[PDB]
Each structure stands twice: as structure tokens, then as C-alpha cells.
Write a protein that binds this DNA or RNA. Structure first.
Lengths: 154, 117
RNA sequence: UUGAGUGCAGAAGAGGAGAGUGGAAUUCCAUGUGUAGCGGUGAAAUGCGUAGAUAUAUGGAGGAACACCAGUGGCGAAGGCGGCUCUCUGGUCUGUAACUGACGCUGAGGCUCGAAAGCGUGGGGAGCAAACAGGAUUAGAUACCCUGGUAGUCCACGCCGUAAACGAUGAGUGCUAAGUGUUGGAGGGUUUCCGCCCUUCAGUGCUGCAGCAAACGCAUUAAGCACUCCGCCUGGGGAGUACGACCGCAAGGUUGAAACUCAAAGGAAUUGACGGGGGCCCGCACAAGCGGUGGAGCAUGUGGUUUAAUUCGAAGCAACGC
């Protein structure tokens, strides 16, 4: 925080897929400590994955990671009382965390009646350049490089 | 129109505004662009954010009349000329002469009062 | 003849006055190209622009100041003096010694010079800008901020004669450890010396013995040891005021007290405290996240209105489910 860098807390893999990434995916769904309900609806999401255009239950999640994950972001690095924010390359763990945030934390807005059609089909859509989280990254890269000239020298 | 296609651009900048004009080799004028003319107000005309889009709105009208090569002339040293050139390269020009001529006296007249702020 | 002066030989130098000249930059004017803004602030506004602005190339007018060289460099008694070319002219340093032979130093009265601002007469205005106008800020702002704008700043001829005119250190001479740069010389070793090394003259910085000082500090450019001559001081206010006198067109200048008040005023240093001074650190203090309050309903605590009484305390953190 002030003195030095802090530890980062690597996690435990799944009880089924033996994945840390899917574990972290569960943990950015979990509200009020109800882990079993979020875990079970994510296994239900994998069951919806497996039936409708069943290709691979995990490659669809990796392609959902493909079409979302950033490479650029601006950061307000002024020096002498300016507003010269610099498009900066992102840390890789923060990159994946922004990807999980753009997948799940945008999926509140589908508004369909079945309670996990906003989850399962939503991450089905992100595998093949659909879902509005892809265009979130698109407009993020387009508002990036808006100061490509007068900020990349720092 | 006439497709002159080889000219010189002029970058004039203050501490509160900047003006880019792409001219001929005379330089007779083709098109100018000003940071106030693109909708900005107040103090925001100092930043090179207006320099990029002023260069774009200059070069569009410029190469509608046919334009390949361009030379750089810089006056009024501030923030504008740092990013005006590299934004001027971006819409397809052939920057090949960069000069910074400043109107410099040899102690001719007097500067005004200081500011007691 | 040792001090003090003219020899002859050199040397350096923004020393002075007078006469001409060079380019850049600003402002104005003309011309072409080119359209909706330019300019300014913490933020805005006043202002200029379709009667073609700003901007960009070409010329034309005029005034002022001299970019790098530039250095704790130089010159002069001080004030001061920086583009270049020429005429008159002042001063300093180094050698040397035939020549004069104590001719010196200081200097009350007197005279001369003397930054800016100011006054009179006659010119010119490119900028800049007291007085003044307008916009803005503020409770108010006859200021700081922005847009304009006269006298002035320049030259010639007269006047005034002041400054934080300061090294706040009067002038002349002699004597008293070192080290280190640098400006201008003379001599020796050596040498394509243009370098380098040693010796010595005049400036000019920086550091430091003895010695002095209340301390800070100074210290061969003494604030050390002394002699000669001049100026000035004797508590803070009253006051560089009053009268008298002299100078000036005028503002003003020079010389210069008392009545009455106060028990202090003043220099240098030490410890705290403070600053809208500075350098470093540290905390869920920022930054990264997660969940909230302020929106809605209700409970509860204060301020206000109330009645006959709404009993008392607690008021930023550090009072208000106390």
C-alpha cells in the first residue's frame, strides 16, 4: 500500500474441473457467502453449455475470455498539474479480473425470466464475438489512443 | 482546387490557443483550423487534444484539393507543436522538413509589466 | 637621492565627446492567398472581426534598444560605460636612470562633476506606461487581475542637486604566516613554447594563523600594530519641525533649537511557539476493490414552535441509539 507490494493469494482448484479459473469465476458470482448456490448454478450453466451446441465445456469459457480480455487502458499519469492520461499495458492478473468483471458483472442486464439464461447463454454468446462485453472492450480501445501522441512519451 | 500537392503547414501556438494552417510553397492558404473553431472553450485549447483533431480537420480539407508532401513550421513555443506533427503524420502526409522559427528580438522593444499574482 | 616629478622604450582598456553606418524584432501601410472567429483568465468579462479579422508570402514608413561574445572580466574620482567605422582628447601599468633635487600629504571656506523623478523652450512617438475609462474579484476594493489610454521615457539648450549616491568601512605611508584561482606585464630554465616550470610587479576573487571584536565576523584589498590631517557623535520621541539667513521660476534644498513627554528605545546571540516556508517518513490517508448513507417507509436522537409544564447536561474532530 504505502511501504511495499502485497501478497496476492493464489487459490484452490475446483472439486470437479480442478480449475482455479472456474473457482475464481464462482467467487465473482458469490453474494453474502452463499457459495453452494452460485457453484451449483454454474454447474447448471455448464450443463446448458453441454447440450445446446456442445463443443467443449471449457473452451467456450476460454473463448468467452478471448473476445473480452483487454490489452489497453488509459491511466491518469499527470506530472505537473496536467490531464495527460497514458494508455498503459495492464497487469495480466488485473487483465483477467477485468475480463471476469465484464463477463459476470455486465450479465445483470439481460433481464430474461429464466434465472440463469443471463449466465449460461450469456457466456455462450461471448465465445464467438457476441455479447455487449466485446463491444465494451472495443469502445475501451477506441477511447484508448485518443491521446496516443501526447501521452505515450511518458 | 488545381492539385498543387506539395505544400507547407504552419503551427502557431499560444499558452491558451493554437492555430494550424496548411499552405502552399508560397505559402498561399488552403485551409486553417483553430481549437476554438472545433467547439472548445476556456482553457482547454492549450492541451494537445485539440491539436490532433485540429490537424485532422485541416488535412481533410487540404487533401480534398490534392496534397502529398508537407513541411513543418513551428511558432509560439508551448504545448501544441509537440503532438501536432505526429498527429499530422496520421492522416497520410509526407512530412520532410521540420523547423522551429521563433520571432526573437535582439532587445528592441520593452516587454510589459510583470504580474503580481 | 631613497620620497616626489619629466625622460626614451613599450602594453592593455564597454574612459569621454563629435560625426556616419549595420541587421534582426515590434508597430503601421500597401498587395496576394484565405473564412468564423481572434484575444484574455483561477474562472469569466470588457475588446477587435462579413466595412474581410487573425494567419501566411512580398515590399514601403518610422522610432527605440544593441541577441551569442559576457567571464567574481575591463575602464574610470564617483554617478556610470557593451553593435560597427572615423577626428580631437583624459587617465593607469612595466622597463630604465643619464636629468630636477624634498618640490610632499591632508585640506575649514570657494569651485567643478553628480542615477531616476521634476521644471522651461523647440522637435518625435516603435513599444512600454503614473493620472483616467471600462470589465472582473470582494461584505466593501477609489488596489492586486484583464482591455484601452495622456504626461513621461528620446534629442538639443538651460535649471534643480537629491538616493538603500553602500564595501552602510575618509584619505597618505610603513610594518606583520600560508594556500589557491584569474586580468595585464617584466626576467630566467627549457623550447615547433603557443603550451610548461621557477622568480617578480600592479589589480582582482576564495579559504584560512597570530591579532582584534559583545557576538556575527575581519584577517597583505585588515575591522591587526601604529603616526599626519579632515568630517561626525553623546538616551528614544518632539523634528531634520519653528524662527533667522542664503540658493531656486516652482517643487524644494543648505544651516538648525527649545517648551513638553517617556523609563525605556537599541545591537547580537539561546530556548520554545508559529508560518498562507522547505526536505524526509508513517497510518483504509489517498490510489485498487467490496458494501453502504444521502432517494422510499418506519424506529430513535438533537435544533426550532408549543403549552401550565414540554425538568437538567452534552455543541468540529473529541455533542446528536450520548
Amino acid at each position: 500500500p504505502r511501504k511495499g507490494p502485497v501478497a496476492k493469494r493464489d487459490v484452490l482448484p475446483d472439486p470437479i474441473y480442478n480449475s482455479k479459473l472456474v473457482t475464481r469465476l464462482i467467487n465473482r458470482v458469490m453474494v453474502d457467502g452463499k457459495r453452494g448456490i452460485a457453484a451449483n448454478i454454474i454447474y447448471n450453466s455448464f450443463d446448458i453449455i453441454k447440450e445446446s451446441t456442445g463443443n467443449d465445456p471449457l473452451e467456450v469459457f476460454e473463448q468467452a475470455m478471448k473476445n473480452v480480455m483487454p490489452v489497453l487502458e488509459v491511466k491518469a499519469r499527470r506530472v505537473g498539474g496536467s490531464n495527460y492520461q497514458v494508455p498503459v499495458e495492464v497487469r495480466p492478473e488485473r487483465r483477467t479480473t477485468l475480463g471476469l468483471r465484464w463477463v459476470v458483472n455486465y450479465a445483470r442486464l439481460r433481464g430474461e425470466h429464466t434465472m440463469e439464461e443471463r449466465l449460461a447463454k450469456e457466456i455462450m454468446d461471448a465465445a464467438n464475438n457476441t455479447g455487449a462485453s466485446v463491444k465494451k472492450r472495443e469502445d475501451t480501445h477506441k477511447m484508448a489512443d485518443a491521446n496516443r501522441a501526447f501521452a505515450h512519451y511518458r | 482546387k488545381k492539385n498543387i500537392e506539395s505544400g507547407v503547414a504552419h503551427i502557431h501556438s499560444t499558452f491558451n490557443n493554437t492555430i494550424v494552417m496548411i499552405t502552399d510553397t508560397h505559402g498561399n492558404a488552403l485551409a486553417w483550423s483553430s481549437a476554438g473553431s472545433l467547439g472548445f472553450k476556456g482553457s482547454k485549447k492549450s492541451t494537445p487534444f485539440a491539436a490532433q483533431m485540429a490537424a485532422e480537420a485541416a488535412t481533410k480539407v487540404a487533401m480534398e484539393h490534392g496534397l502529398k508532401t508537407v513541411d513543418v513550421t513551428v511558432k509560439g513555443p508551448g504545448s501544441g507543436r509537440e503532438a501536432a506533427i505526429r498527429s499530422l503524420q496520421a492522416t497520410g502526409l509526407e512530412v520532410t522538413a521540420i523547423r522551429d522559427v521563433t520571432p526573437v528580438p535582439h532587445n528592441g522593444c520593452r516587454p510589459p509589466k510583470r504580474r503580481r499574482v
